[PDB]
Design a protein around this ligand. Structure first.
Ligand SMILES: OC[C@H]1O[C@@H](S[C@@H]2O[C@H](CO)[C@H](O)[C@H](O)[C@H]2O)[C@H](O)[C@@H](O)[C@H]1O
Ligand SMILES: OC[C@H]1O[C@@H](S[C@@H]2O[C@H](CO)[C@H](O)[C@H](O)[C@H]2O)[C@H](O)[C@@H](O)[C@H]1O
Ligand SMILES: OC[C@H]1O[C@@H](O)[C@H](O)[C@@H](O)[C@H]1O
Ligand SMILES: OC[C@H]1O[C@@H](O)[C@H](O)[C@@H](O)[C@H]1O
Ligand SMILES: OC[C@H]1O[C@@H](O)[C@H](O)[C@@H](O)[C@H]1O
Ligand SMILES: OC[C@H]1O[C@@H](O)[C@H](O)[C@@H](O)[C@H]1O
Ligand SMILES: OC[C@H]1O[C@@H](O)[C@H](O)[C@@H](O)[C@H]1O
Ligand SMILES: OC[C@H]1O[C@@H](O)[C@H](O)[C@@H](O)[C@H]1O
Ligand SMILES: [Ca+2]
Ligand SMILES: [Ca+2]
Ligand SMILES: [Ca+2]
Ligand SMILES: [Ca+2]
Ligand SMILES: [Ca+2]
Ligand SMILES: [Ca+2]
Ligand SMILES: [Ca+2]
Ligand SMILES: [Ca+2]
Ligand SMILES: [Ca+2]
Ligand SMILES: [Ca+2]
Ligand code: NA
Ligand code: NA
Ligand code: NA
Ligand code: NA
Ligand code: NA
Ligand code: NA
Ligand code: NA
Ligand code: NA
Ligand code: NA
Ligand code: NA
Lengths: 134, 134, 134, 134, 134, 134, 134, 134, 134, 134
């Protein structure tokens, strides 16, 4: 059960925000939105499609979207900000790759209908997917 | 738990919309009604009965009802829009048939009291059953 | 959770309506109150007692109360209108009997503190117990 | 989950009403407050403590509080009006005593911080603790 | 479910209040915020991390945070005010110490990122973390 | 799971023994069959039907069956020997009656198909129904 | 969990016996096999296929097989001997029909690979499907 | 589920060993009987009664029985060796008394039917009650 | 819970059999190993990993492993023999292909460490993974 | 339920093996003990304590104990061999540190009562905790 403008999915609620922010700020906005929120985390193929479809339908934009997967210790060591060990990974073709050794934040590729992930420059200004418990 | 004009059923909420739309526009209407909605999917006889009765009682019309099953690959591969599994099919007599090879979207047949399905011209305009998670 | 004027019980909500109706009108009235409602069905001893005391305190009357149990094929094959599973029967003394071969609808016997059931003439006017999913 | 002015506790909702009433009236006030309410029943030391602390903080008064325990048959066979089992008792010192054969209704004693029980004349006016299923 | 501005966590709802109060007044303020609230109790590693992060982001201050742990008997016998079991302790380095034999109330230590506890003078003014059941 | 020759029922295991014993000896025999056994207690309609049918088929006799219900205080205050709650009673017609003020033990009545109970002289010899946790 | 020669399926265990018996005797054998057994009952399409496949694989014969569905009051009023109201029915083409007014016991049609049911002469000597709880 | 000579109770298995040992040895005997065993801890009146009755029937002797409660710090801070919470206490009359400052280990008193507890000299030889997770 | 030489995984038990058989004979061997068995079906990445590792560790060979997925209608309609749903596919590079239109049965590819699948000549002789419910 | 010489805990079974092995050999030893075993992983405070006391009573030694936590990519990206979810970490004081840049395997520090963890040289010989699904 969630607010009517959020996507209910397996116990949690999701929502894309169209305000562009770096990954760091996206996490902080979700965190400061309401207590118990973070950038979204995925844990099963089913959710990726559901979220992708939802974003495609409600994202008032065309820009990619930040999710809660960032490689803190720079070396393909990703963790979910919602503290739920990485047990799922639907990486896009030829991704990740730390392009120029300056990309450690996963984003949903808009070209892939948001069905494929991609390591990105955390400083990039994308839209983001918050996830909350209400 | 669902809104007062929706039908609570096995974790989901269902509602017939008397508005006539093509299958496509019906799915899209459900998807944009609120996040987490699709044309209803069915997975047990009990649901067909409940919904059939629901529709008979609440549908302000006599038209057939679109549901989320459509043969996207036009080769009898029926798939639910909510990505649920096709483990239940209650086809009406002689259906599906792909009449004039222009019928790939499923509807609830009015004459059957909305209990059996039939492939129909996706272009047809029927009422529809939305299914949502709240 | 139910509306404040309903009785929450084992997942469903119940309510006595003091309007006197025929079994059939009572059923249809419940069905049209909101999607997912029927004459109440029982499945355990505790519910009978619960309901019995409920009705006694809220029934602005003295009449019997219709419930969703009815012998559709007039042969002692009782079925609940909510299609719930018929696995509990708290018949009153010497019931059912299909008295005069014209009693096929079940009511809560007011003289048994609304705890025992009696097959009755479906056209009799009784108060009724609706049961809904909210 | 309960209304904001009610105390949620092990599935039920409790509330002290400061209005003074006889046991019988307190019971009927709860019963008619909303379907599924009774004078509260207690089932573990934890509940006595939570309730005792709740009443001390919210009770606007100093009177004892009626609870759903009563000796209907006057043989020290205490029963809860909510038909729950008498699987826990926390009588005050020297109670229950059926003082002068005129006390068969149980109240939480204000002098014990509302922790302990005392059989009281049912005709006494006490504040009361309702318990409801919402 | 919790009010939209609270932290939903394992069945309970939490919220930091930035008003500075003594431990005693923090408890009372929580208890009087609505029936069923107390200073928070902790029972798992996850709750400490979740709470610690929630406080880091929403605490409009830099002060320590009172919690429901206190040593009523002043002999290192810590009890939670919500009467839950003391089955989890995350003491800061060299704590508890009953410093100067005046510290009997527990607080989340700001310097530990609100992850570790310290027994403190109950008369000290800190922000506080309430925990309610709604 | 129960030993392959016992009746698995709602978490417990039941077995009728055809040896004729007094109520007291039936209890003791159950208690000494293995730790955790007692004369059976009943708590639902389904258990009465299931037990009644099980006894009709496996009872190598025609005698009545002792069960764990007894009136220790001899004042119609029936308690189960397994100390479970007396929340379900299925007394035969005109029972219990403390006949001749000597009947304080309960038995399943053969003539009722072992569905209904009767208080009986504890010194009477009946077959008995044990209930064990394995 | 079941014995290694039984088919575990949704909480219960199933097993075809090759001894031919009338429906009445099949029920009595299953009942007398171990306490808590009856002729099998089906409640979902999934089970029918699973049972059909299992029977096809382990049935040391070619004869049809009795299941726990019999029309006691002769008039298309079937009930499951395991007392679980009829909520599923996968009747074979042109079945039932009380052929000659002397057929009220459902059997699994061997020609249909045991995937289709059929009303039969309860006196017929078929193999049977027991179902137990262990 | 437990071995046949053990008492199943609320998830654990209990057993009285008639061998007389000091508290410490009893604890270590349980601990080494099999991984996950300790002297028993009690958490509700029901358990005291079940256990008391169990010991009276199976204990081959008349000696008191050690249980996992001990005052490690000798300040009346009783703790269970199985680290379960001390959320229930049923001391015998005039106990615990740290008689002569030499009693810090708890035993079930034989004179009370093994229902009540007494702090005893840890060096005393008692029978003991183990508790295991199988 | 499974036999000691089987791999417990999400309610089911799996085991590789080093015996070489055609896909068909592998399914049949599983089906006749004990009721309730089929060639394993997969529904999550976690299972592929667990089984892949299991096979690497326990498979006494170097051959590929048959699993229950087969395109029965030779038109890329993959179906699990255990009738589970095809909601997970981890095809190996360039697969499936229907090489020489004579490959319709799936196997776990050895060179991929038994993590990815490939359509193969059902007539091939591979080792196989049985899946059973015990 | 586990073998009598294992520790049942939260769905899994655990056992310390006093054979001193390298982290890698300990893992493989567990993997080959029976399908579904790995070096143990932890996820909650209670397990640490449970295991800690378990090992202390059964470890025929003094060495540290290997657990399934290891930093595969030598960059502080710790992962459990059972692929379970990495969401709990009870590191010892100043750990992890990758001392000399050669410690990438985790052990239960014997000096911390086997409660805290230490990243260690994978080639060190330690005792180990296996974890299995039975
Ligand atoms: O008419 C007064 C008596 O009614 C019966 S109950 C009544 O019984 C008839 C058959 O005799 C039909 O089943 C009805 O449906 C049923 O309501 C009571 O048992 C008696 O005590 C009188 O009250
Ligand atoms: O060597 C004795 C001290 O050991 C440390 S623990 C030890 O610390 C080193 C780095 O200093 C590495 O992390 C090792 O992996 C780790 O085991 C204790 O903290 C001290 O008390 C001494 O016991
Ligand atoms: O006769 C063929 C046609 O039958 C109709 O009943 C149906 O609406 C069409 O979809 C088509 O199947
Ligand atoms: O004198 C005995 C009296 O003691 C009082 O404390 C109590 O309220 C009365 O009910 C009565 O029992
Ligand atoms: O030196 C001891 C003191 O240490 C401080 O850090 C703490 O705030 C005090 O509560 C007291 O424990
Ligand atoms: O007449 C009263 C008697 O009725 C019998 O049927 C019963 O066995 C006795 O227990 C007693 O109740
Ligand atoms: O004299 C006091 C004594 O009372 C006994 O009943 C008890 O076993 C002893 O532990 C001690 O307390
Ligand atoms: O190149 C085509 C072939 O590739 C092989 O690796 C595979 O085993 C065959 O099934 C076929 O797909
Ligand atoms: Ca990139
Ligand atoms: Ca058609
Ligand atoms: Ca009647
Ligand atoms: Ca009194
Ligand atoms: Ca301190
Ligand atoms: Ca009697
Ligand atoms: Ca026929
Ligand atoms: Ca003592
Ligand atoms: Ca291929
Ligand atoms: Ca280290
Ligand atoms: Na998520
Ligand atoms: Na659906
Ligand atoms: Na009902
Ligand atoms: Na209560
Ligand atoms: Na808490
Ligand atoms: Na029982
Ligand atoms: Na069945
Ligand atoms: Na215990
Ligand atoms: Na599977
Ligand atoms: Na683990």
């Amino acid at each position: 059960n969630c607010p009517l403008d959020w996507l209910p999915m397996n116990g949690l609620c999701y929502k894309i925000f169209n305000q562009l922010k770096t990954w760091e700020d996206a996490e902080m906005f979700c965190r400061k939105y309401k207590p118990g929120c973070h950038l979204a985390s995925f844990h099963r193929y089913g959710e990726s499609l559901e979220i992708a479809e939802y974003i495609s339908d409600y994202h008032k934009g065309q820009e990619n979207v930040w999710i809660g997967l960032r490689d803190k210790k720079k070396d393909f060591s990703w963790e979910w900000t919602d503290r739920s060990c990485t047990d799922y990974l639907t990486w896009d073709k030829n991704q990740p790759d730390h392009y120029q050794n300056k990309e450690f934040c996963v984003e949903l590729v808009s070209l892939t209908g948001y069905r494929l992930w991609n390591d990105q420059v955390c400083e990039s200004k994308d839209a983001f997917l918050c996830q909350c418990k209400f």
